[PDB]
């Protein structure tokens, strides 16, 4: 079957510059594993993203339906949603700016979380 | 259909392609997906699906009808579809 270990090994084969994997406890109602990936260029991002899905489709998953690829339009961030794992593939410079690893390592303590601000909705007159 | 008076209704209508989820043999209750025209406690006419896909479903069913008098094999009191989760079954965990 298609599992975490198989994909990461495939990620190594296609030479992902950055791979980060965060497991999630059952209490949180989200994916068991969240994965963050990197690639040098958009062309590399497209190639690696396609490779994982192509390997996924070939590697059993007959019970599971085909997985559509998200973010291919963006040249800097591509994300593929598999059954038990989600891999987000981006550029190294794009990776550090978003700091996805901080989000999951620090579930609610990430620094950029505080940077969010609010707005208003008052009656004009 | 339910009549609404001058405003309507009270017209014969048919709903097609309703699957059966379960049948209670003791009380002869059939559990059918979807809604059926008419009010509660209203008599309805039930016949095998006439859709082209289900042209010949009686081959795997009692061809003339089910005869309890024959008693070839006593049926369970409650008949369930495979997907249906029977009560008293373990709580479903999405694994």
């Amino acid at each position: 079957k298609f599992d975490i270990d198989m994909l990461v090994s495939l990620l190594r084969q296609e030479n992902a510059r950055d791979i980060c994997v965060i497991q999630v406890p059952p209490e949180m109602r989200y994916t068991d594993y969240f994965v963050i990936g990197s690639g040098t260029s958009t062309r590399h991002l497209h190639a690696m993203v396609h490779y994982l899905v192509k390997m996924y489709k070939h590697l059993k998953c007959r019970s599971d339906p085909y997985v559509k690829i998200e973010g291919k339009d963006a040249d800097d961030w591509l994300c593929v949603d598999f059954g038990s794992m989600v891999i987000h593939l981006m550029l190294p410079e794009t990776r550090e700016t978003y700091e996805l690893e901080k989000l999951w390592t620090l579930r609610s303590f990430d620094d950029q979380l505080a940077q969010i601000a609010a707005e208003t909705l008052p009656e004009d007159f | 259909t339910i009549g609404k008076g001058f405003q309507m209704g009270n017209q014969n209508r048919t709903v097609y392609g309703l699957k059966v989820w379960r049948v209670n043999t003791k009380h002869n209750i059939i559990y059918v997906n979807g809604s059926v025209p008419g009010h509660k406690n209203c008599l309805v006419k039930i016949k095998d699906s006439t859709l082209p896909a289900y042209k010949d479903s009686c081959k795997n069913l009692p061809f003339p009808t089910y005869f309890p008098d024959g008693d070839e094999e006593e049926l369970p009191e409650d008949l369930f579809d495979e997907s249906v989760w029977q009560p008293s079954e373990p709580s479903i965990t999405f694994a």
Binding site: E70, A74, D75, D76, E99, R107, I116, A118, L121 | -
Partner: protein, 115 residues
């Protein structure tokens, strides 16, 4: 239930959203075949005199059973390229967006709080 007008709250760290502004927000367009916008539905929001795509993450309309009814309308901005405008989301976000049809992994990859 996001629809015409419908004062909304921009849950994002985007510069336009983050900066306070006097004008109440009048959402323009709902990116759906139907006219009603619910959680996970793309919408167009006017912020700071500019138009930016937004993704609904909460609504005050009564919802289906076994789900939490939010007390405020929450949205997240998404760029044209598909990447979120803001790098962080503060309000708790339902995790149903993952299974919802569409591209929601990026926004979920930006949502710290999940309920």
């Amino acid at each position: 239930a996001v629809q015409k007008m419908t004062r909304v709250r921009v849950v994002d760290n985007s510069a336009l959203g983050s900066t306070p502004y006097h004008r109440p927000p009048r959402c323009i367009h709902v990116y759906n075949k139907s006219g009603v916008g619910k959680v996970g539905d793309q919408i167009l929001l006017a912020i700071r005199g500019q138009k930016k795509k937004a993704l609904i993450v909460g609504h005050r309309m009564p919802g289906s059973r076994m789900t939490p009814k939010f007390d405020s309308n929450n949205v997240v901005l998404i760029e044209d390229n598909g990447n979120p405008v803001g790098t962080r989301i503060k309000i708790p976000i339902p995790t149903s967006l993952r299974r919802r049809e569409g591209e929601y992994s990026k926004v979920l990859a930006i949502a710290q709080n999940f309920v």
